[PDB]
Amino acid sequence: SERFVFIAEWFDPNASLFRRYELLFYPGDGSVEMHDVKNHRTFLKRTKYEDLHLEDLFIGNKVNIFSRQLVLLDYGDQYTARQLGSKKEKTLALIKPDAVSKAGEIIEIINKAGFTLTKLKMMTLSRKEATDFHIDHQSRPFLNELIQFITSGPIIAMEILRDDAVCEWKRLLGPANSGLARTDAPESIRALFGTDGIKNAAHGPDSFACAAREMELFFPSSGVCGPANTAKFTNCTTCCIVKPHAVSEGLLGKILMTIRDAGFEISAMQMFNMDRINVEEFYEVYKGVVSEYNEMVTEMYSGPCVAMEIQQTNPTMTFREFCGPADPEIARHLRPGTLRAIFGKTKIQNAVHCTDLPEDGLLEVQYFFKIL
Amino acid sequence: MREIVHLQAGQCGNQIGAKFWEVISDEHGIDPTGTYHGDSDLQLERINVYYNEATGGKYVPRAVLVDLEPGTMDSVRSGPFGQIFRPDNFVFGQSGAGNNWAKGHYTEGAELVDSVLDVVRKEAESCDCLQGFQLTHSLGGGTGSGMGTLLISKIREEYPDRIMNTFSVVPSPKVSDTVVEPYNATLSVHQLVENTDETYCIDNEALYDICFRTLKLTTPTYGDLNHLVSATMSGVTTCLRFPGQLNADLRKLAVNMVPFPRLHFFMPGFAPLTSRGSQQYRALTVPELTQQMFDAKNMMAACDPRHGRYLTVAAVFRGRMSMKEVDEQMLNVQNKNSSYFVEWIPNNVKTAVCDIPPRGLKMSATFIGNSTAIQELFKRISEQFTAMFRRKAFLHWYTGEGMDEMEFTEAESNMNDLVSEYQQYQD
Amino acid sequence: MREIVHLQAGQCGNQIGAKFWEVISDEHGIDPTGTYHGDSDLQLERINVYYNEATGGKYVPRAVLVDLEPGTMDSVRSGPFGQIFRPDNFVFGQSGAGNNWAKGHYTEGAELVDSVLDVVRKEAESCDCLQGFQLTHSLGGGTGSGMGTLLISKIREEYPDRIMNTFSVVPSPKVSDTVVEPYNATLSVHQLVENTDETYCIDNEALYDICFRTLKLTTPTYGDLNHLVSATMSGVTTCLRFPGQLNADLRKLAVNMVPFPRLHFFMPGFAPLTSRGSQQYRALTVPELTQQMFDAKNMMAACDPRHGRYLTVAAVFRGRMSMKEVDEQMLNVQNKNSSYFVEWIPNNVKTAVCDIPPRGLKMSATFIGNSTAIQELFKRISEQFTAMFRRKAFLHWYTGEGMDEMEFTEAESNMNDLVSEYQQYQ
Amino acid sequence: SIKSIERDRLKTEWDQHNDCKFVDSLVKARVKDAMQGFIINTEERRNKLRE
Amino acid sequence: LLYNWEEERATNYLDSESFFFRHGHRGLLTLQPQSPTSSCTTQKDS
Amino acid sequence: MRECISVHVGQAGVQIGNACWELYCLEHGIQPDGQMPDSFNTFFSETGAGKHVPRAVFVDLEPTVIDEVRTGTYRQLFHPEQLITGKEDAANNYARGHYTIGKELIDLVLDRIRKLADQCTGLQGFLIFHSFGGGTGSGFTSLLMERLSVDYGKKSKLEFSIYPAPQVSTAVVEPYNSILTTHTTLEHSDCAFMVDNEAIYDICRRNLDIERPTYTNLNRLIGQIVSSITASLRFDGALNVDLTEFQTNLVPYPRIHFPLATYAPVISAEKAYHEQLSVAEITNACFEPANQMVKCDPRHGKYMACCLLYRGDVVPKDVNAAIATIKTKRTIQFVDWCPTGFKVGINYQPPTVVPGGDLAKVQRAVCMLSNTTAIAEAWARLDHKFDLMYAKRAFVHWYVGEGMEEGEFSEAREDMAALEKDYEEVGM
Ligand SMILES: Nc1nc2c(ncn2[C@@H]2O[C@H](COP(=O)(O)OP(=O)(O)OP(=O)(O)O)[C@@H](O)[C@H]2O)c(=O)[nH]1
Ligand SMILES: Nc1nc2c(ncn2[C@@H]2O[C@H](COP(=O)(O)OP(=O)(O)O)[C@@H](O)[C@H]2O)c(=O)[nH]1
Ligand SMILES: Nc1nc2c(ncn2[C@@H]2O[C@H](COP(=O)(O)OP(=O)(O)O)[C@@H](O)[C@H]2O)c(=O)[nH]1
Numbered sequence A: 001s002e003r004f005v006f007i008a009e010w011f012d013p014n015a016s017l018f019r020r021y022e023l024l025f026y027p028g029d030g031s032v033e034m035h036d037v038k039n040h041r042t043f044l045k046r047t048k049y050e051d052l053h054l055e056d057l058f059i060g061n062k063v064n065i066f067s068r069q070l071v072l073l074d075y076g077d078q079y080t081a082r083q084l085g086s087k088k089e090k091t092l093a094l095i096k097p098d099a100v101s102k103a104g105e106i107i108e109i110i111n112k113a114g115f116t117l118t119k120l121k122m123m124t125l126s127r128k129e130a131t132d133f134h135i136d137h138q139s140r141p142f143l144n145e146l147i148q149f150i151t152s153g154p155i156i157a158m159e160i161l162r163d164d165a166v167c168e169w170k171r172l173l174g175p176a177n178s179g180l181a182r183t184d185a186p187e188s189i190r191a192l193f194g195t196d197g198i199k200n201a202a203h204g205p206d207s208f209a210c211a212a213r214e215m216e217l218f219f220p221s222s223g224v225c226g227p228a229n230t231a232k233f234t235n236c237t238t239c240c241i242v243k244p245h246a247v248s249e250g251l252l253g254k255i256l257m258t259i260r261d262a263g264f265e266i267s268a269m270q271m272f273n274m275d276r277i278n279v280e281e282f283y284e285v286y287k288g289v290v291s292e293y294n295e296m297v298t299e300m301y302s303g304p305c306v307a308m309e310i311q312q313t314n315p316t317m318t319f320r321e322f323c324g325p326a327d328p329e330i331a332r333h334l335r336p337g338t339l340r341a342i343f344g345k346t347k348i349q350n351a352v353h354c355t356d357l358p359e360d361g362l363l364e365v366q367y368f369f370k371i372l
Numbered sequence B: 001m002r003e004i005v006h007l008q009a010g011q012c013g014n015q016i017g018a019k020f021w022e023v024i025s026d027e028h029g030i031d032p033t034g035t036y037h038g039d040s041d042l043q044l045e046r047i048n049v050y051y052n053e054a055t056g057g058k059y060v061p062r063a064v065l066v067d068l069e070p071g072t073m074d075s076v077r078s079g080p081f082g083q084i085f086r087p088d089n090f091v092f093g094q095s096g097a098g099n100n101w102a103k104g105h106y107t108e109g110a111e112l113v114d115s116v117l118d119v120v121r122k123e124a125e126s127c128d129c130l131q132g133f134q135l136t137h138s139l140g141g142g143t144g145s146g147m148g149t150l151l152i153s154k155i156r157e158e159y160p161d162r163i164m165n166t167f168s169v170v171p172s173p174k175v176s177d178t179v180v181e182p183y184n185a186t187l188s189v190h191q192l193v194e195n196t197d198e199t200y201c202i203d204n205e206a207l208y209d210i211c212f213r214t215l216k217l218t219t220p221t222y223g224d225l226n227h228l229v230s231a232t233m234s235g236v237t238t239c240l241r242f243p244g245q246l247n248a249d250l251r252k253l254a255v256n257m258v259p260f261p262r263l264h265f266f267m268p269g270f271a272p273l274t275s276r277g278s279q280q281y282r283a284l285t286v287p288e289l290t291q292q293m294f295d296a297k298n299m300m301a302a303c304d305p306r307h308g309r310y311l312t313v314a315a316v317f318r319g320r321m322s323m324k325e326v327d328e329q330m331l332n333v334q335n336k337n338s339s340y341f342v343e344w345i346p347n348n349v350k351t352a353v354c355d356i357p358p359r360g361l362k363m364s365a366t367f368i369g370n371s372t373a374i375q376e377l378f379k380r381i382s383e384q385f386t387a388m389f390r391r392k393a394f395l396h397w398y399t400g401e402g403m404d405e406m407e408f409t410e411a412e413s414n415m416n417d418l419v420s421e422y423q424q425y426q427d
Numbered sequence C: 001m002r003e004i005v006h007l008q009a010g011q012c013g014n015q016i017g018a019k020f021w022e023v024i025s026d027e028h029g030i031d032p033t034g035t036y037h038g039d040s041d042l043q044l045e046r047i048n049v050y051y052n053e054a055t056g057g058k059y060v061p062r063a064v065l066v067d068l069e070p071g072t073m074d075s076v077r078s079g080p081f082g083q084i085f086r087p088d089n090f091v092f093g094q095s096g097a098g099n100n101w102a103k104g105h106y107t108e109g110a111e112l113v114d115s116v117l118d119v120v121r122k123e124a125e126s127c128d129c130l131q132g133f134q135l136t137h138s139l140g141g142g143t144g145s146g147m148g149t150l151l152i153s154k155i156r157e158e159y160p161d162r163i164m165n166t167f168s169v170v171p172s173p174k175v176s177d178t179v180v181e182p183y184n185a186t187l188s189v190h191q192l193v194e195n196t197d198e199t200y201c202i203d204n205e206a207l208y209d210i211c212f213r214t215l216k217l218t219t220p221t222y223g224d225l226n227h228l229v230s231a232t233m234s235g236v237t238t239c240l241r242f243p244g245q246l247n248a249d250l251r252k253l254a255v256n257m258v259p260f261p262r263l264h265f266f267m268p269g270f271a272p273l274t275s276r277g278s279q280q281y282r283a284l285t286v287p288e289l290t291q292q293m294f295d296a297k298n299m300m301a302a303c304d305p306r307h308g309r310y311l312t313v314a315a316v317f318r319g320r321m322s323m324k325e326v327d328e329q330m331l332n333v334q335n336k337n338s339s340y341f342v343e344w345i346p347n348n349v350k351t352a353v354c355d356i357p358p359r360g361l362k363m364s365a366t367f368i369g370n371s372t373a374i375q376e377l378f379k380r381i382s383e384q385f386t387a388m389f390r391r392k393a394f395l396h397w398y399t400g401e402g403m404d405e406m407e408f409t410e411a412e413s414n415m416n417d418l419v420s421e422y423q424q425y426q
Numbered sequence D: 001s002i003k004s005i006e007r008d009r010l011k012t013e014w015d016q017h018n019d020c021k022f023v024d025s026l027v028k029a030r031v032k033d034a035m036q037g038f039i040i041n042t043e044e045r046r047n048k049l050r051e
Numbered sequence E: 001l002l003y004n005w006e007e008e009r010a011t012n013y014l015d016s017e018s019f020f021f022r023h024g025h026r027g028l029l030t031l032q033p034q035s036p037t038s039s040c041t042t043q044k045d046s
Numbered sequence F: 001m002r003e004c005i006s007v008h009v010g011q012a013g014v015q016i017g018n019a020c021w022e023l024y025c026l027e028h029g030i031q032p033d034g035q036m037p038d039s040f041n042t043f044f045s046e047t048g049a050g051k052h053v054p055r056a057v058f059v060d061l062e063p064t065v066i067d068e069v070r071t072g073t074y075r076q077l078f079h080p081e082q083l084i085t086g087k088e089d090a091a092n093n094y095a096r097g098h099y100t101i102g103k104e105l106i107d108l109v110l111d112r113i114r115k116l117a118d119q120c121t122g123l124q125g126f127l128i129f130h131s132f133g134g135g136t137g138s139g140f141t142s143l144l145m146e147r148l149s150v151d152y153g154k155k156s157k158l159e160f161s162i163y164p165a166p167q168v169s170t171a172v173v174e175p176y177n178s179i180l181t182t183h184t185t186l187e188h189s190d191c192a193f194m195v196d197n198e199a200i201y202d203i204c205r206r207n208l209d210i211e212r213p214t215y216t217n218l219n220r221l222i223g224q225i226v227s228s229i230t231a232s233l234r235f236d237g238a239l240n241v242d243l244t245e246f247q248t249n250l251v252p253y254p255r256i257h258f259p260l261a262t263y264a265p266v267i268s269a270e271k272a273y274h275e276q277l278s279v280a281e282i283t284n285a286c287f288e289p290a291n292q293m294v295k296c297d298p299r300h301g302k303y304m305a306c307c308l309l310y311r312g313d314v315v316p317k318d319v320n321a322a323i324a325t326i327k328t329k330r331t332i333q334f335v336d337w338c339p340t341g342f343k344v345g346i347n348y349q350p351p352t353v354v355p356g357g358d359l360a361k362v363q364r365a366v367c368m369l370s371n372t373t374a375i376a377e378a379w380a381r382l383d384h385k386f387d388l389m390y391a392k393r394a395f396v397h398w399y400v401g402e403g404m405e406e407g408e409f410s411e412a413r414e415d416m417a418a419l420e421k422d423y424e425e426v427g428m
């Protein structure tokens, strides 16, 4: 027994009406079922289904059932509200200017702690939104270096949802000063990572009430948010990475370590996309050429992408041939050093989707955060 | 052009015939939401056979969903592909499906037959050339063997030239879960051997015993037999929607198969069935499937071959094979069995090789027998009727609902014409 | 914009209007200290129909309250609603009428109408546009039938344009409470037909039924039979006071119902009546209301409607509603029991729709109807009269106060020829 | 004369408005041809990626 | 449980007897105190 | 530039003009506080800032129902005087609204038309919505058709009138008030399109799936039939049609101006993505009595003329191959003297669905405005109910009371009799 119910919301394509249903999931047996709250008769009867997971049962995370895409909007129940929403709390974090070249181990520590990452996007904020971060802070110390790092160095804002997220973030972070943390010498995100104490770190809110103020300071409603945090071109604007489903698998930290290996930079990450139109807009070159196009748009339909602009660094190995052949088994035939043999999880729908022709990288990047 | 109109009556065929619409829609690539979801391009240009289109270019099926009680139309609107049907031509009813032939025809069937013909017309009068009627019925009750007769005897007055190929489950040789059976079934064989032009047969008993011997399953549910029947009917209707090298429509099967007008009940099959553990220890050729076609223990019928000299075996191959390997191995099985094929037909067999394999296996096929061993299924149900009639054992309800005594003699007398007119050409 | 002037007389009236003026206080959110404390804003929209304005936001009614003795309006001030009724609107006498007609119609209630008519003609010209009148009064007593019929007579002499309505408390035909009921009720209905357009006849024998077998109370008072009478009063004007789907006023059901100058004796009703203990087992829907108000055991006068044919039948509705389902129900009650209507009118049923149900209800309706089986409300009084005229039973009271017997003799020639019009059509 | 003058004035004002809109519509049709050519350029990049 | 068992027992919890109830009893209304302030008109909700 | 000053009246036109003038907000960009977020100047008029204030006039006599629209969602859009108030309802009689309560209000409504018409540089005609079913629409407005037609002379005028239903009938005395007002407008209304209320409550249950309907659920299906008629004076397309064609093709005679009405695609939103919206299926639906918005059967009578207006993606070859297969139906009969019998007007604009509607987002609409002689048996019953009441002289005395004579009961009966022997001389 012990079903969990939700209210679902699907956009009907032919007659363009937004449709509200009630989905039911049955943990411990794998069943789903769907009635309609709008009209009380049953259209979808009960079925078993294997791909849905209890970690995918979170409000907001958009999950496909039987080739239909829906976002779980409400809590229709007090039982599941008590069972999940009392524990699932959100915490705010931010990659500062120093942590871009060391983010892989910190993200692996976050994935070992088990927080679900909702939105982790690079941002360059405006004047008022930049000053609203430093409006709250006031004390004896001189924070000129930290203020110049915030106003100059690029940053990323991220949201992590977890059971007692503030408590687990505090216990993972530990002491505040870098020298004090190193003198305490426990394994911590502040002890191992971060530069010069208050100069740069991964941001952590003091209290659950102050987390709202910190989140509103760093990432407010998108009026003056700032669409870009990186240069549009550097004469090699030709590498696009995207992670639609391997972020849900959790290997984002490990692939950040393997791309930090062999001396490759990472420029800009963000996590906003519409499932179809935005991807269609830039899979346009891919539209005539590629086969299994349905699958290659379905595993971008599946989830959000931490999609990332990257430049060519060395000419000794091309980034496309580091990314590897289009098939993971062909990669495992040829060389284990290919990123599909290390990480690729589908037959053609690789773990890192790139561009093939080197010309269109600049236009795809300008679309992906300059336009969007 | 080429098309087949469909209906789904009875409980037994409603579950199987809606298990049809997934084995179709995954081969051709339609999502449950009606959008095209195919990998290849070749299986879109013959979609006008089973499917009518919808505005925006999405795809709906040709089917009619009618049975007496609304219990099972809430079971075929179900999880996999319920959204695709038209909600207007869904038909329900009020009165019970109480297994009576007057509940099949005279009492409940009268009010629907005005409405449930106008679901054939609204999907047929908007067409060009009609070629087949596919109706998924049974032979047990007044639910499926009083509506399977009703929805085809009305039609033959107006659509007389074309071919009407249903698919029906015959009673099992051990235990049937209906006790009232041969008042209706023998009253429905009076029209099915008359009006229809081909009419299939399926045992329930043999459907279980494939799963224990060859599949080596532990637990065969009722979800398994659906798949085993739905694959056979979706392989014999493929030279009408695929490219191929030796291609036959449903009216080729009118002149190929039946020599004397009233002998058209065929025996289904499907060749490359195997288990899980024995896959690596099995090889796939055209000779290695051909044994499994002509396996005595791969048919859907319990009748042993020793009573049967096959009239017209038609094994429709589907794959990438050789046309000589087909022709040499559909004859090398025949000289080895002289006494089990008729001497008054010189070529007893017929093939058809196509170009598109099933989803999953590189090559498969579909045996279709036509045997002289099917008198054993004839001798069973005609023998159940004789003791139950002299008691008038359950005749109180049918007489109460309105079926006279002098017609139950006549139905068994004409069911006796399906062995007597069979026995002339047995020898 | 269309106010209502209310009249009261007798002590029979002033227990009813004291109960009429509290459901108006309920529905408009009026507390018993004169202010307003309701949570809506549509209740404050047309407040002016029953609530004149003053300083401090006070809302005090357009009420007239009259008797010939001081012994009754002491108790109306001493009720639960003392501060709302106007102190200048308690016109009083000194001597009780005492079950006699000329004590109020010719001598003691006649000298006092010049102080009532001062109150009305000042007040009725303070309305920007009056719709008309209403009266709840005793035909049984000596003040309502004696004095109040002059106020129906003399005010209609002033303005002939407006509409006269009557919540008549007609006596029961079975059990009688006064030995001069076949005089005070006989003589009062001599002047009702030249003067009054809406006549709602109410019986207490008809209402002792309803609070036992339908509401299931073993100990009924007047104050819990007064509220059903006070239900149907505010249940008439449901559409003038509020917006909705089809509004109707008190000229709109005095045109749909009365095809003749003298066939205008209505028959009241109320739809949703169920027990206090079993309130939450019924489903308060559209078929539940119509199935009750088309019956004889939901009728507020004591005549069985089955002995005749209704000429015309009105209705009104309230609450959010689906108008086709009522339209299916109104033809069914014209197609099924077609023998309970006359065949010489095409349409016999009217409906009208409000929007906001009462405080505590969801679906409300009120039944108003012309019927020619109201003869048995009048033939019993008209046969009681001549069984005591022929024995001259009480004529010394009446002659010794300024009457004749020719004012008596013609008061049944009206009452006979009234029934001698209703008889032909049924 | 009053009806003819007022009608001709409003007709010529909306006619110059439709004239501006028609020259803008010709530029819009050239813009649609530019979008068609950019789709052809995406087809050229599709040809290179096909290679 | 004499004559009229159920209703007379049930009504006391939801609700000198004649003197107290001389003004009346709450017969034709629900036990709930308020169903006012409904902004429910056809041309307001439609 | 091509303005269309409409007229609503009664307790109908204020509950119609809440849902008919709702789509004119939606088909253009007009938000409910009068702003763009120019084919709209038929129904709107632009000031210096941005404010598009409407053009029609809505009248009642009581203010209980006019008070909603000034206090509903749509108050700043509508003009602070174009909604014209009163003080008391005419209360279902022809006496009050034609001589007493419609006489004291007529000469401010006459003022505001002249103020609204003279600013309209290019007005084409007048559109009237008066309900025969009461006292205002019968009384206030049949005073107007002999008052507008005297002042503004020879202008075209057409009606979309609310005829009371044959089986259900809300009020009692209507075989007086429906019969009486039709005697006066018979020579002052060049077309009379009609609808009923029962006749659409059939359609909303069998074509839509929603039972338990509302007047507002019924009003948008009259609120959509207007904008497939007026759209040919509005939007671009192959064939536009002015209001000088409706009285031309559809009105044969002087005293035969009583056609019918039908609107084709009536399907819910749930069934939108299933049935093929073929131009034949939209066409052959209108010729069936089940789709028809007047409760009358055309199989007993002859057609006399027809019309059509089309929307959206019309393929103009296939309409002519769908009109042509109507001609091979002997169930559909014609009188001989109209052997052509059609009109087509084709626009580009597909119909627009309201947010919160019952009809689907469809692409192809068809509206017939058909003259037929089987409307004469709808006039049969309303005379059959008359002398069955007039013999007893029932309900009379409020008609003579407010300044009339009894004797115009003797003519509005006797005028329809000559009309009842007019329609049989023409379908013979
Ligand atoms: N179906 C439908 N019917 C309506 C609608 N509005 C009004 N009606 C009909 O209109 C008639 C109402 O009568 P009125 O509109 O008040 O007639 P009137 O001309 O205003 O006469 P008076 O009430 O005296 O002012 C009834 O038959 C209603 O059914 C509507 O929105 N939908
Ligand atoms: N595939 C499948 N077959 C079924 C299912 N349920 C019942 N059947 C078959 O239906 C038969 C019942 O007899 P049937 O002729 O259908 O009785 P009727 O419905 O009254 O006509 C059983 O013998 C089963 O073999 C099911 O869920 N799936
Ligand atoms: N139901 C009910 N009946 C009443 C009420 N007040 C008086 N009556 C009836 O009125 C009649 C007496 O009227 P009466 O006092 O003589 O009238 P008055 O002298 O003019 O005040 C009796 O038959 C009572 O039954 C009341 O509040 N409710």
Ligand SMILES: [Mg+2]
Binding pocket: F010, F011, F061, F062, F089, F090, F091, F134, F135, F136
């Ligand atoms: Mg009115």
